[PDB]
Structure formats: C-alpha cells, structure tokens
Design a protein around this ligand. Sequence first.
Ligand SMILES: Nc1ncnc2c1ncn2[C@@H]1O[C@H](COP(=O)(O)OP(=O)(O)OP(O)(O)=S)[C@@H](O)[C@H]1O
Ligand SMILES: Nc1ncnc2c1ncn2[C@@H]1O[C@H](COP(=O)(O)OP(=O)(O)OP(O)(O)=S)[C@@H](O)[C@H]1O
Ligand SMILES: Nc1ncnc2c1ncn2[C@@H]1O[C@H](COP(=O)(O)OP(=O)(O)OP(O)(O)=S)[C@@H](O)[C@H]1O
Ligand SMILES: Nc1ncnc2c1ncn2[C@@H]1O[C@H](COP(=O)(O)OP(=O)(O)OP(O)(O)=S)[C@@H](O)[C@H]1O
Ligand SMILES: Nc1ncnc2c1ncn2[C@@H]1O[C@H](COP(=O)(O)OP(=O)(O)O)[C@@H](O)[C@H]1O
Ligand SMILES: Nc1ncnc2c1ncn2[C@@H]1O[C@H](COP(=O)(O)OP(=O)(O)O)[C@@H](O)[C@H]1O
Lengths: 267, 548, 570, 436
Amino acid sequence: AVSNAIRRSRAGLADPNRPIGSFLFLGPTGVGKTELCKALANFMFDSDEAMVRIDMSEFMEKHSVSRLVGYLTEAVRRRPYSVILLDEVEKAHPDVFNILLQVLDDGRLTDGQGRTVDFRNTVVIMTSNLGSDLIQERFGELDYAHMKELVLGVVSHNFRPEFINRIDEVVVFHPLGEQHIASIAQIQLKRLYKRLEERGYEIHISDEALKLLSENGYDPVYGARPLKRAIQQQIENPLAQQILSGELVPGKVIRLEVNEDRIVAVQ
Amino acid sequence: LKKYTIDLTERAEQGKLDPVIGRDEEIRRTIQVLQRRTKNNPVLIGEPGVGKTAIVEGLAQRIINGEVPEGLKGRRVLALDMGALVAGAKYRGEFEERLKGVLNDLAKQEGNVILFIDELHTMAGNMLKPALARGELHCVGATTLDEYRQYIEKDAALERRFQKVFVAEPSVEDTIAILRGLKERYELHHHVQITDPAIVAAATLSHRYIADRQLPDKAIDLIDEAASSIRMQIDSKRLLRNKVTDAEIAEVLARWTGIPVSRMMESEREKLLRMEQELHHRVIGQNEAVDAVSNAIRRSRAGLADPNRPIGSFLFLGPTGVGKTELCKALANFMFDSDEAMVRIDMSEFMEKHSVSRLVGAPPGYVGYEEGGYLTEAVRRRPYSVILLDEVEKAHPDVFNILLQVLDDGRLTDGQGRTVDFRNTVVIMTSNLGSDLIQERFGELDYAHMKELVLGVVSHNFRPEFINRIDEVVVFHPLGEQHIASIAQIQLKRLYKRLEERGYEIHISDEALKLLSENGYDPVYGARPLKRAIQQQIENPLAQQILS
Amino acid sequence: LKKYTIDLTERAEQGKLDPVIGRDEEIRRTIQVLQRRTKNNPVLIGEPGVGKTAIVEGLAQRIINGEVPEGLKGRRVLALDMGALVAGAKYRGEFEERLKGVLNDLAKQEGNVILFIDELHTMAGNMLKPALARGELHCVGATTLDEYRQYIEKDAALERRFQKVFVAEPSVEDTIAILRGLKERYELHHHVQITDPAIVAAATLSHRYIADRQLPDKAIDLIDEAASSIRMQIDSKRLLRNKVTDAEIAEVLARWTGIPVSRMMESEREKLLRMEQELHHRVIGQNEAVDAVSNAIRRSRAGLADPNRPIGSFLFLGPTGVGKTELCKALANFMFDSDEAMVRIDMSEFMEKHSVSRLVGAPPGYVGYEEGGYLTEAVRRRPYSVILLDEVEKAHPDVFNILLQVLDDGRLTDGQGRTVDFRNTVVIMTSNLGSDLIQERFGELDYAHMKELVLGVVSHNFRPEFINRIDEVVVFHPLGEQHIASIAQIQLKRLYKRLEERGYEIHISDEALKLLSENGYDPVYGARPLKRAIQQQIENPLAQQILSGELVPGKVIRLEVNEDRIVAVQ
Amino acid sequence: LKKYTIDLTERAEQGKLDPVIGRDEEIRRTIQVLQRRTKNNPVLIGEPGVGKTAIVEGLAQRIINGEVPEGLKGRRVLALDMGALVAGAKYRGEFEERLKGVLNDLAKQEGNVILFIDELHTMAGNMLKPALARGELHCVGATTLDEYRQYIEKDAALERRFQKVFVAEPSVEDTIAILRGLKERYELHHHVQITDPAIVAAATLSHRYIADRQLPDKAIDLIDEAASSIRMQIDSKRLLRNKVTDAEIAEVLARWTGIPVSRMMESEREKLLRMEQELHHRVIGQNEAVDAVSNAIRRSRAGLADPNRPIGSFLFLGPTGVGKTELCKALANFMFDSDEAMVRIDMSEFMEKHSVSRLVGAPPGYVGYEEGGYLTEAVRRRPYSVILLDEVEKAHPDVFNILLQVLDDGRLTDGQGRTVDFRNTVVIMTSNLGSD
Ligand SMILES: Nc1ncnc2c1ncn2[C@@H]1O[C@H](COP(=O)(O)OP(=O)(O)OP(O)(O)=S)[C@@H](O)[C@H]1O
Ligand SMILES: Nc1ncnc2c1ncn2[C@@H]1O[C@H](COP(=O)(O)OP(=O)(O)OP(O)(O)=S)[C@@H](O)[C@H]1O
Ligand SMILES: Nc1ncnc2c1ncn2[C@@H]1O[C@H](COP(=O)(O)OP(=O)(O)OP(O)(O)=S)[C@@H](O)[C@H]1O
Ligand SMILES: Nc1ncnc2c1ncn2[C@@H]1O[C@H](COP(=O)(O)OP(=O)(O)OP(O)(O)=S)[C@@H](O)[C@H]1O
Ligand SMILES: Nc1ncnc2c1ncn2[C@@H]1O[C@H](COP(=O)(O)OP(=O)(O)O)[C@@H](O)[C@H]1O
Ligand SMILES: Nc1ncnc2c1ncn2[C@@H]1O[C@H](COP(=O)(O)OP(=O)(O)O)[C@@H](O)[C@H]1O
C-alpha cells in the first residue's frame, strides 16, 4: 500500500484533489528511516540523481526558502523522464507551503521553472517519516500489534488535524525491536567477516558478539554508531593480536572466547 | 567604387526600394544628426522590425524627390557588397579581410557618399573603427536595442560618431496609414484587391494578443499572408476571391496567436452579452442577485473610476468553501484571459511588525533584497492581473498602510528600485471577521443581512481611512445544497477520462450523487473532512477491480 | 589503406590481441548497428578505461574465430592511421589526397572493411561526412562520454550518422571474469603465477580504494603491477615467491593510493598496539578510554570500519588549552611522522556567506576555478590523511552543509564537479562548545550531560543529526595540577632541544619544576599559561643571559630557585 | 627521428648527473611500473623541488650501474624534449611525422628505451595516446602535482595511461642524507668545504624558515648559495673561510627571510641588551611594556622562542595617550629602522563580518581574489615583521577567529589557499579596554 496510489493516481481513483500523505512512518535512525530512497535504483528509469529530500521539522522563520529557487539545468533536463523525490514534509507553515500547495497536484511547476515540467510522466511523491520520538524500535524483531495508535501524538504534535486526515495510504511498518540491528545492518557482520575469504581463512564470531550484547546498549538516538562502538574492539587489530604479521600459516580456525566486552582474539 | 557600384539611390530611381510613407517625425532627426559637422552617423535603435527600412531606406527615395535639406543635395547613399565580399579565402580570418579594398574610395568622395547600415553590430568591426576614427567615413547605421546596449560599452571610436536615435513603434492608428500606400505593391504581386476595413484588422485586433512583432511589422505580414492565402484558396487543386476582407485577416490571426475566432471576432460589448453566461459556466450562480459586481467591471470600460487608482476596489465577504476560490479565477478568465492570474496570499504572516518588507520588499542592505516582495514581484511579473488579498484582517494591530498607497495614488513602491504600477489591477479582499456564520438562515430573500452584523463588528481591526477606498462590499452568495449538484461533477473528470478507456459502463441511476451532496454547506467543521465522504466508501471497493 | 592502417583482424590472426572475455551485449549491439541500412556506424562511448577499444579488439577476434554472425564473417576490421594520415603531409591537399585514397580504397573493398576509427573526436570529418551518410563507410568510433559530447557532437550533419553504443564499466563481479581471461597474458609476460585470490582482490580492492578509476582497467594494473613486483623479487639481489597473492595486490594499493592495506609485514604489534603510549608522549591526559582516536585507526588500518564513511569522524569538544588541537598533531605525527602532515583547515574566513568555495572550489568558469579547493585537492592528492577542522563552530552553517557529505557519504563533490573519496581520511573537528560545562562538572559531566544543554549552537548552528553523523564526540577534560606538572616536562624537553641545538645544557632542580607547575596552573585557561610561564620565567632570563655572555655554552645550566624566582647559574 | 638521441643514461655514464640518494621506494615503484605489459608509464608526481626529475636521474644512474633488476639491466633512459619536437615544425604534419618518427624508432629497440618526458603536461603531443596504452613506449613522465591537474587530468583518456608514482617531499632527516651525498658536487664546483654542521643546519633552518619551497630544494640551495658566497669571499678583496660552516648558512637565510639564528655576536647583541634603553628613547614610562616587548625580541634572537607560535603576541591594554601604539612604532623603529615598518592594521576599519575578507583576501571566484589580503600578503612578502592590530576592539567573532591561528601555531591562509606563516612575526594588539 505505498504504490497503491499509483493504482489510484497514475490511473486515477482515490479523489486526486488531495496531497499524498503525511501521517506516521515510524523508523530507526539511519537504517530504514531515510534509506528507503537509496534502495530505489530498481523501478522504472534507473535514476540515482533523484536526491531531493528535505527535513521540514522545526522551520518557523521566514528565511529558509531561498536555496531551492546554479545547478537546475545540470541534472534533470538532459534526462527528463525520471523519478523525483520528496519525503519528511511534516511541520511547516504556509510561508514555505505556499509553493508546495500546488505541488500536491497539477504536475507542471510555475515558480521559477515556467516550462512544461512533465511530472505526470515523472513522479510527485510526498511522505512524512517522523519516527524519532514518542515511540521507537529497539533493534528489529517484534510483532504487528503496534500499527496505528497515535493520531495527535506522533506527527501532529501542534498542527491541525486537517493535515493528518488528508492521507490516502495510512500505512507503516512495525516498531520492531530487541534483537536484530546487527542483522538489518548485517553489512558489518557478514560482509566484513568474510573479508579474508581467501588464503584459507574464515572469521568466526562468538555468541558474545552475537547473542550476548544483541540487546544491551539500547539508545533511541544513535543506532548505527554504537553498533560500531560496542563491537568496536574486535575487528582488525584486536583480531591482529595473533593473526597478522608472521602468523599467516594455515591449519587453524579463527574464534573468539569467553572474556569481557573487549576480547583479544587468540587462535 | 572600382570593384562594384551598389547604389541605394539607384534602387530608389528604379523603384526596387519599397514605396515608403509616414515616418517623417524621425527623419527630422536622422538627417539632423546626419548632415552635421561631427557626430555624422545615426543608429536606429528599437525592436527588430520597427521601421529601420521606413526611415533609412526611404531616404534614398527622398533624395531624388527633393524634400531633403540643402547640404544633403547631390548626396548619393551608397552601400557595399557586405554579405558576399567580406571574404575571399577558404579558412577563417575573413571577418574584415577585404574591407580595405572598398573603404579607400569613400575618403575620395568628398562629403557625398553615405554608406548603408549593413548590420553595423556585425561590423566586431576590426576595420570599422580604423575606418571611422577620422570621421570622414560618412554613414548611416541601425541596430536593435539588444544589439545596441549589449554591443558596446565606452568606445570613443564609436559613440564619438553615433547619436542615440531610439526609434519607437508607431501606435495603433499609424500602422493603418502605412498599409494604404502599401496595398499598391500587393495589387500587382498577388494580383488581389485590398479594402479599407480589411487593413484595420491587422493592426487593432492583433494589438491586444500579438506582441512578438512591432506595430508596423505585424500589421504588414498579416495583410500579406491573407494575400498569400488567396491563390491558396483560389487554386487549391467557383472560389475566386481576390477581394480580401477582415475575415481573411482574422482567420490567419486566429491560426497564429493560439486562441480561436470564438473569443476574438466580437466587440467587447458583444462578448459582454454572454459574459455572465461565461461567468456561470463555472460560477454556482444566484444570477438574480450577484450581477452587481458583474456591473462593476462593466463600469470599467467608460472610465468614470479614479484614474489614480486600479480598475477595482472591493470586499469579498462570506463563508469559506463557497466561491473563495471559484469566483476570483472567473473574474480573471474573462478580462485577464488566464488561469494563472492568482496571487493568493494569506495575511497571517503579520505576526511581527517587521513583516511589512516581506510582501513588499526589504531595504537595500537588509536581508530580503535579492528576491524582492510577494505582492510586488508577482505584480512585477503580472501587471495585467487581478489581485486577491486573502484574509486582510490579520494585519498587525499597530501596522497597516500596506494597502493604502495601492488604492489612493494607485502606485506602490517596493524595496528594489522601480515603482510597481497597479493601474491594471482589481483588488479582492477576504477579511473574514464576522461572516463565518453560514449556519444561520439569513439567505431566503436577502443576502446582505449576513453582512449587517459585520459592519458593526469588523471595524475594530479596520479603520475609517480604508473602507472609503473600496466602493462595493459584495457579499458571497452562499453555497446551497441543491447547487452542489451543478459544480461537483468537474472533480470526477479523471475517472471520466478513465471510463471511456476500458469499454465499460458504470453510469449511474442515483447511486453516486448522494455522496456528492456532502461537500460544502457545513455546520461545524468545513469542507476539508467533508471531501472524505467519497473516498472511503466508493473509491476503495468498487473500482479496485478495474486494474485487475 | 591496407599499406598503412593497422589491420586489426590480421593482428588477431596472429593472436597479437588481448583476449576479450565478457562484453557479449556490447559486441552484439555494435554488430546490430554495423549491419544496418542507414546510420550504420557505432561509437563505443563510455568512461575512459572501460573497454571501448577492447570491444573492437574483441570484435576482431569474434570475426576471425567465426563467432560473428553470417554477413560479417571474413570482414576485415581495420583501424585508421592514428595521425599517420596527418604525418608528413606538408603540401596543400595532401591530407585530402590521403583521406580520399583511404576512402576510395574502401569503396573498392565492396563494404567488407570495418574502419575502427579509435578516438573519433580527433577527426577530415567533412571528408567522411559523405561516406558515413550513404552507408558506404562501416565505421566504428570510440570516443569517451565527455570526449563524445564536447568534441563535435552536433555540427549539422554529424549527429545522426553515428549511433551511440554505451560501454558501461563492469561491476566487480564482471571484472573478476575480465581478469581471469587476461591473466594468461600477464602470467606469460612476467613469468609469475597470478593467483585466483589475487584476481578477486584486485577487482574488489581497486573498486573501493580507487575513486578516479573504478574501471576494469584499474583491476588490471594491480594485477599487472603486483606481477612486476614479483619480477622485482626474483630478478634482484618455495622461498623465492613466484605467485602474486592478495597480500601482493594490496601492497600495490598501499603504494598507488597510499592507504595502508599491508599490516602482515609491519610492526603493528609494536606501533599500532600503542594504545595511548605513543599519544601520551604528546597528549598527556584525555584518558576516558585508551584514546578513542587510536581506536578508529585501530579498527581500520587496512580498512575494517564501515567503507562508506571516513576512518574517524571526531568532534573534539573541550575547554581551551586542553589538547584538542594537540591530539590532531599527535595523531598526524603518529600516522605520518610529522605534525604538519594533516589537512589543517582552520575556520579562518569560514563564516562568510560563501567561504564554502574556498575549501571545495570555485564554480566552473570563475576566477579561482582552475586551482581547485583546499580540502578537496588535498584529499584527491592523498586519500589517507588527517583532516583537522579547527574551531569548527566558528564557521558558517553553509560550511557544514557541504561537510555533511563527507561525514556520512564519505564523498564530497567539488566546484569543478568531481567526487572525492574521504572514506579513508580521519576528519577531526575541534571546537570550543561546552567549555563552561567541563570546568564546572569534573566527573558529573558525561558526553550527553553537555551535548544538548549547550544548544543554541547544537540546535541552530549544528544540525539535529550532524552530531549523529560524527562518529565519536570526544569531550576533553580540563587539566588538573597532576597533568600540568607533567606537561611542564614535555614542554621543557622541547626547551632543552631548543638549547642543545645551540650547545647549552639545561638542568632544572625539582624545586623549580615545582615552581613552574604552581605558576602555570589555573583550570580555566588550560595549559597555555604553563608554557607562557615557561617563556617568561625560564626563557626570558635565559635569553638575556645567553645574549649578554653570562652563560657559557658547553657548561651545564641549572635552573635553581632563588627568592621567589627561577634563576640560571653555572 | 635520428635528430633525437638524447641519452640520459650516457649523461649518467659520463658522470654528468648528480648522485641521487635514498628514494629507493619511488625508484623501485618507478621500475616496477616500467616493467608491465600494458601502460608501463609512471608519472613521478609531487610538489616542485621534491626530487622527481632526480628520480629518473637515479634510474639512469642505476641502469648504468647495475643496481636495477636484471630485466631492466642495460636499458636506455632518453629524455624526450617537447621543445625540440615542436621547434621548426612550421609546416603541416611536420610535428606528427616527427613524433611518429620518434615512436617508430622507439619500437626498433623492442622496448629497450625508457622514454623520459620531463614536464609531461607539455605533451602538442596529441598522438602518443594509443602507444602509451599498449606499452610501446616506456614513458616516465615527471610533472608536478598542480600541472598534472590542469593539463593531464583534463585529458581523462590520457591520465588513464599514466600511473602516478607520487614523490613525497622528504623529511629533514632524509634531506640531510640527501645533502651528505650531494656536497661533493658543491665542494667541487665552488672549491669549498661544506662541513656537516652546515648540512644538519641547512635542512633544519630551511625546513622551518622556508615555507614557500619544498624541503630538498631549500637545504640544497642554501648550501649552494653559502658556497658561492664563501668562494666570493675567498676570491674578492684562517681569517677567511675555505669552509661553509653552520653560521654561513644562517647568513644566507638572514638576508633572504628576515633574521638568522647566528649573526648576532658583535654589536647587535650589544643593542639587544640596550633595547629597553633604545625603546625608552621614544616611549618613556611603561617599563612593564618595554620589558615585555624586549624580552620577546631577546627570546627569539637567542633561539629560545617557541618555533611554532609567533615571536611575541602582546595585548596592549591601557588608557588613551599612554604609548600603546607608540611602543609599536618605537619597536618597528628599533628593529627595522622606520616607524612605518609595521604591518599596521587599524582594527576599527573592519566593524562588519565581511571586513575580515581584506586581511585574508576574497575566496576563489570573487572580486579581489587574485590580490590576496594585506595581512597575509604583507607577511608572506616580509616574514619577519611587526603586526600592529591597532585599536583591537570589535564585536565580531568571525573577524576575531582569524587571530585564533595567527597567535597559536602561527599560520594563516589566503583566500587563494596559500598558508602564510606568522611564526617569525611580532603580533601586537593595542586596545583600550581597561581604560576607566
Ligand atoms: N571485456 C574485456 N575483456 C578483456 N579485457 C578488457 C575488457 N574490457 C577492457 N579490457 C582491457 O582493459 C584495458 C584497457 O581498456 P581499453 O579498452 O584499452 O581502454 P578503453 O576503454 O578502450 O579506452 P580507449 O582504449 O582509449 S578507446 C586493456 O587491457 C583491455 O584489454
Ligand atoms: N594534554 C596536553 N598534553 C600536552 N600538551 C598539551 C596538552 N594540552 C595542551 N597542551 C599544550 O598546550 C598548547 C595549546 O593547546 P592546544 O591543544 O594546541 O589548543 P587546544 O587545547 O586545542 O584548545 P583551543 O585553544 O580551543 S584550539 C599545545 O601547544 C601544547 O603544548
Ligand atoms: N633524492 C635526491 N638525491 C639527490 N639530489 C636530489 C634528490 N632529490 C632532489 N635532489 C636535488 O634537488 C634539486 C631539485 O630537484 P629536481 O628533482 O631537479 O626538481 P624537481 O623535484 O623535479 O621539481 P621540478 O621543478 O618540478 S623538475 C636538484 O639539485 C636535485 O639534484
Ligand atoms: N609613554 C609615552 N612616551 C612617549 N610619547 C608618548 C607616550 N605616550 C604617548 N606619547 C605620545 O602621544 C602620542 C601617542 O599616542 P598613542 O600612544 O598612539 O595613543 P595610545 O596611547 O596608544 O592610545 P589610543 O588613543 O587608544 S591609540 C604620540 O605623539 C607620542 O609621542
Ligand atoms: N512607413 C513605411 N513605409 C513603407 N514600408 C514600411 C514602413 N514601415 C515599415 N515598412 C516595411 O516594414 C519592413 C521594415 O523593415 P525594418 O523595420 O528595417 O526591419 P529590421 O528592423 O528587422 O531591419 C520593411 O519591409 C518595410 O517595407
Ligand atoms: N467549488 C468547488 N469545485 C471543485 N472543488 C471544490 C470546490 N469547493 C471545494 N472543493 C474541494 O474541496 C477541497 C477543500 O476545499 P477548501 O480548501 O475548504 O475550499 P476553500 O479554500 O474555498 O475554503 C479542495 O481540495 C477542493 O478540491
């Protein structure tokens, strides 16, 4: 139900005199909050130059609009048929929403563009992905009993309810938790520890860095850097206490042992 | 003139130059800066096609007919073969290669020769300022204002010789006089007959819609295109019409501007008959009452308004969801001929008294100068627009006069450098302070009784100095319940685009209009959640089986 | 023609071409445009390095081995005279006689000759314009992508006769398959055995660490240059290694880029296992952990941090005089053996409304355009550096808005318009925020008992998650008297070497080093008043006594205590 | 063609090349890039003066001496001159037949000629691009780090063919070893005795006082110029030096950057102890100011000054009319013999945030970028000066930060990017703050 409006606006079903939607999209900081436009190099035109993403959270002053309005004819006009993004458009005033009130529809941009801006064959998307406070994940494995519960509590803190009932696709994934941040970000567990896949080598990890601390140092702000701060003490040179520089002979298996949170990886 | 002897005055004595008329207000400068002692090189500056032929190229036709001043007597206007004998080699370097072979003879002519324009912004000019620095080189030039201002900066080998003849376009009436002595060259070439009301349609009707060619340029080729549509009409392989009309001109004018004959071939009084009928193609109605504000723009053609004021000065009071968006665009659809004449600005921005310079413009030096204002830069962009000032009453309780100079003296000055003119505007003000009470009855025979409680209550944020400068306080006619059923079907048009694409018939008999009668006409909240009386019970389960 | 232009199929007949493995689509596509009626001339365009000549070198082995379809079997692939058409043709019309002679010798080759005009943008041009128009010339071009757009792309009738064939660069999975086929030519030239560990690790490693060449060309010349270093091994004066390995491929990448992927032959046990022991020689204090700047260079010496963000992103917050900028000169001295071997961007003239172009470069066509930017050129030139951003809060917020891109993406595009890998650099941002919250709270302050209480720069000048994009916000504690009494000594050993370079020996009785540490200690100002009390209680009488001839060189000078003073005597 | 036998290996055979020392890991990389079958073309890249022309002259001295691998033994390093290939190539296609006539008889040796295009970025030279890729010419380029950027990096199909074998600027300890192996070329051209104190103290003194140059080009020059000064004093009219000593190096730097370490022993050291008498001849009163100024000038002349910071950085707080900018005019009259020899900057002229762009200059791409700013330019010109930041009482942190680096570590960079060292200057800041 995210490309459902493509079955409802690109064909045209679900009352097209509307914005797309800015209710809750809860997420973890870095790995599934803003990443879901980096993994969209696989859909229709292969446009990796669609980078228009805006934080629109605490903009109360009237002096933050004069940067979007010289590189407009360097990236989008050589290849017109593309994807065009916008996400996290959540809490602003009509000082900046005055441009963005006819960008909900109408396709063709007349602010300083003026021409045929063929957004009926390009895409116009708005989402609001406020998953920061008042409800969060922990690490990435829970059930689906926390889908939609806060209407005036998570996104619409001090703004009108006519900004949160004009959404077609009132959808979200889970606030999963508790076990899985080294597996949604398995890029620094799988890929980095089959790094020496040759020379007869294989890096096996202990259950201390797998199931022991898989839950402990939970902070709801940082996420990805304490993965590289609670397991920052075993990767290359604490591994190179007995592996590198003279002990490259095969016939032994790489392992970690029962110690405290910093281990010398002896073989 | 040993190599060639190309003569403009010989082309005048043989009649190869076109017969010229008018343009004697600006031959009385071209000559006055030509027969002088110094500064003897005129340059005709304007838009491309203003009449640079009409002044210079007829002067050779004026020499042999003797009405030129003395001193200019016995002067032959010459030219070069510049356009075919600037060159002579194979490769580059031919910008001014063989100029010296044909510039040395001009010194010997002893104050008789006058060399032609030859597009003197293309002569740049490696040899010209060597040739012109003595001043004996006696010439005429002509270049457009984009190719006169951008071209040179401080050349005292050029501006020492050139005089600023900023030539201008004639008016509406003047270019009609040009075509009377120009229809004698089109009676022989196209072999047609040209009449007197036929030549007025080229000038005065293209004056409002066509601007890409100046006034004695667009009125000449519009004539000669119909005269080139005659043998296209006679000899398309019974239909012999060499007498052209204004209908032949208004044909090819409709194929050129983009707009058809349907809003072109009428007087403004003749479309005024169906003005309300074109108003009420998209206006919810109440045509027994709301034709007062229809008469105000109808009062705007005679001219008994203030000439130091815009066209209109009103108040547009009523509820929301009624015509706050609908009535304002339809005033621009008729006179202002546009769907983007809209300057909707909500005046809830005046929470600070420093926000006078944001809709108008910051001073030079203060932040907010590189982008200008809001109620100025859009009017700088569109000086031919209605202006719509949403929710006036939330101006600062100490600060106003944001809208008084626009109405009293008619003009307004932003903080940029140029005064903004508001003379071709109509102000539309929606200061809803006491008319948000549509829930009362108040509307069975009269619609002003809703307004009578406002004039006792709106004036604490208003002033007596402001309500004088707006003539007719026009009340919004309400959105009745039966009146939704006329103007709600224009939202459905994308599915109307869809239903003819699939060959199916889902056309109704009283099954989809009962939810279209739940948009507007509200007691408590408004039409923003009333729009969701449609999507959650029809659009989900009925037409999700249409892409499958 | 055949006397002059290089016959590429007759080079392939002798096997004098490199075996083009892969690229099956771009040879099919360049055939599918070669057998057309109108507009039948390809141009293999793409980045320089990707195989635009190796397509047509591989088409000429697809032709003589019959793997071409019918209709192009037995077709000769010919090059063009690469500047031998424009060789000693002094006389007017000799180049037109040479080019018509090698055009009219294709019209009497019936259309059985494919011209491979390599580097098409060096072309002439009007003389090929008729023969390309009528399909008589079956040309094949190979311009680059930038050389095929900035070199006569339109020019009237010249933007249709050539049909573009885009040669995209291989992936890493393709390039390993590229290198398996070519390795029998580098084994047979260097007389080494390139190993299959070393070809998967010459395409993975040169994809990460080479930002100008993420090509198939760049995996080849790690394969080609590791094999030449084995020729350095066995031709210079089981034990004499005949194989290149992934330890020999990486030793070229530690010399090509200069990024230390090599530690299986280093004293990392000696040098990189000095946790603070090499940094405590010059940064006394800051003992929250071992050092937490010798943990990000310890996570990634060969590179085992996240390879999409820099080696270390540190905010060095603290009071004044505590060692924030000295840790960036003791780390730059530890990595590169010189204090000044970092990219020190002081935020001097960084507040302006455009100083951004100072450290990233002017836009194209402006006045300082051809000289690059300060930050960008210093990391293109050496990708493994330390980048000190001193007093980063004293910069404009527009500076951070281009400095977000180096902290998360690890890649900062510049004003010229090229992207620069900061993924191997160490980006340190010293700053002075929270300076009052550390002198007050001597243990009560955590890292987050501060980093939101000071907020008018953390919320307004800093972004909400700009402090999330930096890896470790190290907070510096103020120097107690146990510290300043011990950096009296490392500021005095700096002073003894300043005098042994003049031939004077300076001794200090411990009554006097007790006296500097009393006169140079106040916790608000850190440790600059200590070394200000060295240069006014020690070096100020010493310079007078050295100048006036009162202190002979070669004798010892004992800075002993006098009546409330430090005096120097013989 | 055969108008080109430019043999850099017979210049090394006849002993006409200078001995190169200790770049045995950039030669070993230059060798092993030159020994691979596709694009064996190294490009000794690096800053000017670093030693990258003199790596190919250490290839040529190893090929002719047999310290190379035995697949590189007996090669020929040939220095291709761009100027000699374009000279006289007036007619059309004479350069292309000249370059192809070089490429042809480079191929006749069958890869036994190592071509050396010194200043590679000068390669009119349009057509070597296919032959560079196949390994048909073994082409050691040696271009600088900024001239590769603005010619060869622009030809992105040509910088593929070249492997940058980056030549880093050596340390002081690597320059003393470079200089200990080069002094017999300068002891023999000047007929002098360059002693080892004059080599340890010429890669030390030039490595700290010189910042506009590299490292191996500064120390080597100083000794080249101290020896040509000694031979001048040997000839022109024991007590004379046959011997370049460490004091003769400092005399060559004293009149090249401002002030030496060692010229002081005669009468300047008399008038440095007489400084507070000399400064009180124009600034009476304020002994505590004249003593705090004169101690910093003595701390530098004794070599005792912190070599990273400036010589002295003072704040002159006082009332009006008490001599705060009379001391800075009597200081610059003392050490430069003119009152108007300060880099004096009235700080009251930059009361705005944009006024800090006149002390450092405009950024790249602005007006007045190419002119610098008159604090960093006037200190880059004369590095030993007095900087009077007079009336230093502004309300802008942006304009104050500039002095965060001038006073600590002693550097401040142009808008142009050129870092100007303030470690030899005396920054005085005379404000009016404790006045009442
Ligand atoms: N598909 C391939 N199979 C084998 N070798 C390849 C392939 N693609 C490229 N190469 C090799 O990559 C190296 C350089 O590629 P080139 O094709 O010579 O460069 P380029 O991309 O053609 O740009 P040019 O040559 O200036 S037109 C050569 O050794 C080629 O053989
Ligand atoms: N922890 C330390 N260990 C050794 N020397 C130190 C230490 N802290 C300060 N110093 C000395 O103090 C001088 C100035 O300190 P710096 O660290 O350079 O400045 P800073 O501490 O980074 O703070 P600032 O002024 O905000 S940039 C250095 O040159 C050192 O000599
Ligand atoms: N390793 C070295 N051994 C001996 N002499 C050296 C060494 N490195 C540099 N030199 C000397 O340093 C001086 C200048 O170095 P060069 O290499 O000639 O110039 P460069 O470094 O190539 O810079 P340029 O101007 O861009 S050619 C010469 O006198 C060289 O002999
Ligand atoms: N202590 C002094 N010894 C000698 N001349 C002095 C002294 N103080 C002031 N003068 C004279 O007074 C003038 C110097 O004034 P300045 O010293 O330049 O101003 P200032 O004392 O620095 O304070 P200001 O007004 O804040 S710049 C010159 O004419 C000096 O000759
Ligand atoms: N008063 C006039 N009398 C006769 N012909 C005119 C007159 N004004 C304009 N024209 C016609 O209009 C054209 C004007 O040419 P010109 O304005 O010189 O074009 P440009 O400015 O592009 O050189 C000519 O074809 C000329 O015959
Ligand atoms: N007369 C109308 N014709 C078409 N659509 C309308 C009309 N009035 C309201 N709407 C729809 O109702 C929605 C909300 O209207 P609203 O903003 O309350 O109108 P107003 O601004 O006049 O109060 C709009 O998105 C619009 O599509």
